Symmetry: D2
Subunit: 27 residues, 4 copies
């Protein structure tokens, strides 16, 4: 249960990291 939630949190964090990398490229 906890492990499940963490998996969804970690996917979101990875997606945010990819978005911030794209933002840095724009900059």
């Amino acid at each position: 249960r906890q492990n499940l939630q963490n998996l969804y949190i970690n996917r979101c964090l990875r997606e945010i990291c990819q978005e911030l990398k794209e933002i840095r490229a724009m900059l």
Copy 2:
């Protein structure tokens, strides 16, 4: 140049706002 620059500034601001919202959601879940 400047209107494109100002638009890009507003666009990145909106992206960062969305990211902040997501991090607030994660905080609540933790």
Copy 3:
């Protein structure tokens, strides 16, 4: 233990949120 780690993760997330708010102001 888990609760402890989450507290330190949540403080970091709150700090990041404050930093991103300052970045948005600069923008």
Copy 4:
């Protein structure tokens, strides 16, 4: 104006890099 703009761009890039590093650390810990 433009050199200040370019510097600010590089400064924000560096901040976002640091934030990415922190989120990677959180991911590892979760």
